[PDB]
């Protein structure tokens, strides 16, 4: 009666690939801001057919102030024992 929602952990979205990426100061200062990030396209990710090389191409919205091309260095090709989990409040009435 206190909570109207299931308290068990949800595994529905567990089967979802995720990439952990560390960004520089200039790039991280604009992508982590909550006054932005409305769903617009920030760029494109290009992967070679044979792999082993990943690059990022941003759009022309940077105001020609930062490089438009970046190299995504895969620090760990195989990663285990890492997961992404969220949390939010529960309904309190009934």
């Amino acid at each position: 009666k206190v909570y109207e929602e299931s308290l068990d952990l949800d595994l529905e979205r567990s089967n979802r690939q995720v990439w952990l990426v560390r960004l520089p100061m200039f790039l991280a200062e604009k992508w982590r801001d909550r006054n932005n990030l409305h769903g617009q396209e920030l760029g494109k990710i290009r992967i070679n057919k044979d792999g082993s090389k990943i690059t990022l191409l941003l759009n022309e919205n940077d105001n020609d102030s930062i490089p438009h091309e970046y190299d995504l260095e895969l620090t760990k090709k195989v990663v285990e024992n890492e997961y992404v989990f969220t949390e939010q409040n529960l309904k309190k009435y009934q």
Partner: protein
């Protein structure tokens, strides 16, 4: 056993698993390159205190 533990329930869910770890580094062959270097150099040059 112990009859009380004082838990705090919350709505949690797994929204993905990490498979690749990446490090973003700007390409050295870009026309805008060497502008970040000046920006980085300005970090040490700055003197916030007065």
């Amino acid at each position: 056993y112990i009859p009380y533990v004082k838990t705090i329930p919350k709505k949690t869910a797994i929204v993905g698993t990490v498979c690749h770890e990446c490090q973003v580094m700007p390409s050295m062959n870009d026309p805008n390159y060497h502008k970040i270097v000046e920006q980085r150099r300005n970090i040490v040059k700055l003197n916030n205190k007065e």
